[PDB]
Symmetry: D2
Subunit: 313 residues, 4 copies
């Protein structure tokens, strides 16, 4: 209970929101039309406490693609169904670059961690093995529905189509992983890439995503349904890797000044988690050099300076 009075806190969220609104820097991702379309002025913040209390300000009901934000979510699912040991048999846990700047794999021929494309691609191949992509996709959709307490969870076919058609780097990664036997026996690599592109194209709203974050903040229990969605083990692992590998190269600076588990996405979203307190989703298309939403980064630094949510405060 670091939030004795929700109303007053809500009032502070609005002030912070308003302050970050003045930050107009950054560039909206434009490698595909579906991302370039977005207005640089879209800005929204949704909060969902461990209690189930809600608060939204700004453009919180405009759908956008999770993109990389889906990474910790599918990682959580894999750990939930397969266990920590099995999953990390295929992907690493190291947050460092190590001496592996832009390398698809580490010295042991394993993706560095679940938060980079190579890792997410490997994780994607571990979920619900043995069924067609249609079934795998439905499986994860149901899962995301539970995390969001049945709130908005859609799909962008146009993003999926464009992401796949222009994802040369991901295909390069897919073939290299095949070279090094990084997938489980009998994996259809190209088929896995399709599933990966689809997952990146799943849509949410600031409001529904915040519930997803709140579930991770509530030990794996959806705050608005009470249902156990993810195992404690899955949640703890996800938060650890989000804390260390979730904000691209800004992770170091982010962990030092913000000290919270988070995962950004090229659509401008930032899934934020305040363990045992609340889940949050900040969204604003304009990204900085590192690929993180400018307004989002600003907002997070401000949230911690004001409410002292840093893990080591």
């Amino acid at each position: 209970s670091m939030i004795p009075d929700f109303m007053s806190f809500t009032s502070h969220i609005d002030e912070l929101y308003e302050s970050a609104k003045k930050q107009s820097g950054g560039k909206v991702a434009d490698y595909i039309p579906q991302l370039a379309k977005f207005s640089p002025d879209l800005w929204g913040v949704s909060v969902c406490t461990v209690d189930g209390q809600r608060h939204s300000t700004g453009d919180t009901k405009v759908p956008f693609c999770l993109q990389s934000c889906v990474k910790p979510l599918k990682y959580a699912i894999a750990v939930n169904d397969l266990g920590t040991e099995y999953v990390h048999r295929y992907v690493g846990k190291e947050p460092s670059g190590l001496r592996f700047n832009k390398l698809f794999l580490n010295e042991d021929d394993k993706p560095h961690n679940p938060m980079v494309n190579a890792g997410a691609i490997v994780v994607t191949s571990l979920i619900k093995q043995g069924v067609n992509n249609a079934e795998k996709f439905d499986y994860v959709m149901q899962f995301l529905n539970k995390m969001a307490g049945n709130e908005y969870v859609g799909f962008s076919n146009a993003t999926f189509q464009s992401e796949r058609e222009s994802g040369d780097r991901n295909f390069a990664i897919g073939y290299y992983l095949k070279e090094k036997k990084c997938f489980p026996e009998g994996t259809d690599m190209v088929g896995i890439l399709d599933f990966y592109f689809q997952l990146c194209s799943i849509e949410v709203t600031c409001e529904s995503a915040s519930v997803m974050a709140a579930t991770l903040a509530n030990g794996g229990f959806c705050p608005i349904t009470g249902e156990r969605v993810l195992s404690p083990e899955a949640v703890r692992n996800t938060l650890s890797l989000m804390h260390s590998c979730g904000m691209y190269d800004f992770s170091g600076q982010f962990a030092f000044h913000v000290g919270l588990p988070a995962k950004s996405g090229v659509a401008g979203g930032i899934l934020l988690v305040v363990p045992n307190v609340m889940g949050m989703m900040c969204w604003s298309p304009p990204l900085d050099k590192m690929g993180n939403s400018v307004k989002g980064i600003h907002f997070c630094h401000d949230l911690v300076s004001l409410c002292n949510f840093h893990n080591y405060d």
Copy 2:
């Protein structure tokens, strides 16, 4: 209050201690005689809660050198006296290797972080500038006394003499930093290295060190004196960097499975901090390939599995 009953908890510390005692692997550091001397069977664990409650088991009153364990301590001192902004003008905050495996500096010509020699060396040059080494040394000694609530804090002249005489790598680092203008204007580099070697040679006991850790766990207040020793800012920064850069290359695996701020030393010590709960010091000379005490690493993994102290539990 995650420790409702101190006595019962104490009983669990003994069981864990006993279990790690069976782990006889590792090699006692032997690059200098002062470290080689130590018996591989020395093993002790001291606990000091935020309350001021104490508990020790094993060889908790045998002096040993902090060595790298002193790094977060002098970093805390620098931040306390100079502030976050000034200090990081000279040293980085990145926990990753990045693509800088064994490099003395990063692309901006700054040590990666305060937890590696190059960084500690730079930090050492920022403390109490303008006075002779004798005065700087006394200054830090008084400081460590306050952190330990006036408990055991000694000095090993033999270690200092040997460390300096055989520290070629540190001298190489010292000259490279001089090359790149990494020190404050007018710094006597060789004189700074002496101070650095001296600090690494400061002695403590598991019992006194645990109080130091408890001070960091108590927001900067010594649990057994009530005195404010370090600013909140200094404590938070220290814990962040300990969490990410304190266990050498094992940091990644350590953060994932243990999730606690810690700093190891070549003497076999591991300064452990459980934020808002307790401070700890585990000591056992035999080190693993990574340079961390074998019994210590084992003990830490066990402590978290049993008492659920992981930051994301």
Copy 3:
């Protein structure tokens, strides 16, 4: 005229051949059946002087695939038809690893040199642009025929089929180059990879290949037909890059002790050139850790110690 008496020299080639024959180390490449099939005892050496004088010893009429040996040949063709400036607009000239160990591209997003797969793949895309692969292939075949003075130049469909079906790393490279716009406008990357696999599957004999080498040693004139096949510019460039990037990581040790332009291949072949004197082809399936024929490497070191052919002798 460093070979006043061809007969006596021929006698020395036989002694060297015989001496290398005792070197039974190495492993026959076995990533595909077409390479694993080969007997580790196959060993042949063919010489073709700038005069047109010939000499063969051992298994000099057994067909084998050029594999990487074709790299300097297609590079020569590209330079011959397009010129030095145009070609190096797409591929580098640096022989070093630089700090790019196993990276597909350098900092300027260009393959390091024509002698590594990424470079050969790019070079392949520059030759005879605008026609179907059938026409490109015939074009290069005619070219290789001229270099060999119409001697044996075949094709292994089985090798081509296997190389393509198991070439995941090359496909990874193909997609990454597409990512970075490394190909000429309108290139069909997958179609280029097919052409690349085909070229690697071209067959020769020690005898025909030696004529090809002799052509490079004769300023671009086929020693046994007198026809100008390659421009002087093309020949000089090819020899420079062969000297520095032709023997995989052994290039450094090879340039120092042998000092001759050469290109090895996974089939066990080593295209050797002694500028203004002769061309040679050594073949022996067993490769060393670096991927070079064991008997071949031995033979080359011996040839230089005996006849003083080192470029700086």
Copy 4:
């Protein structure tokens, strides 16, 4: 005899000299006053054939420090007295960066090659072991006198004093090599650095240096005295490593377009060798980004385009 008529050739050297004279780019090295002093307009070229025929144009009698130009010379001396095998027990032969950009040592803890500071420093420690620096210095001076056929060979005490006083990077290298046991048993590292600084401070003129180059071009025989100065083995090794590691990072581009053994120096000198034809020394203080004399680089590219001296022409 690629120079049938020396007079006409001499006439071409003047035209090339004149053409490079128009190249006013570059920056005169200024890390120490002794180098900053030099006028950016100083420009001279001296030629000394294997015959003993001479030709100079420009500022060919103005003393300047060999600096890095002395590297292949002391390497030659070491090989001459100790043999190839012994010397490379301490230093590598690899020309590549490998993945060792700015690293003092390679994976085997050996300097990459004799042409970089770490290597030159190691080589310096192998020459005339067991005598004081005064004796070592005299020993090398006599040696350089023989290479220059007793022509100008001086010493800059001011450069030596400044180089040593500001050579922090070299001291960093010196301590790191000591860390890794890179020197022969019982080496006085600091004493070796003094000797190294002294050697870099040896002075020559374009005219005397060209004779030194001619000696290397004449298989180790001083063209103007007939005396055997260096063993054939020493000369061949020196030329190989000059060809691949003598022009700093420009080596790759230099080997491709110029194809001649060369070694540059921060004073603006470029020791050039045309095997079996002539030795040359180009000097012009203004250096390019890579650290090579601008006029010198231009002149070399021109010399090869006109007279076809490229090793593979």
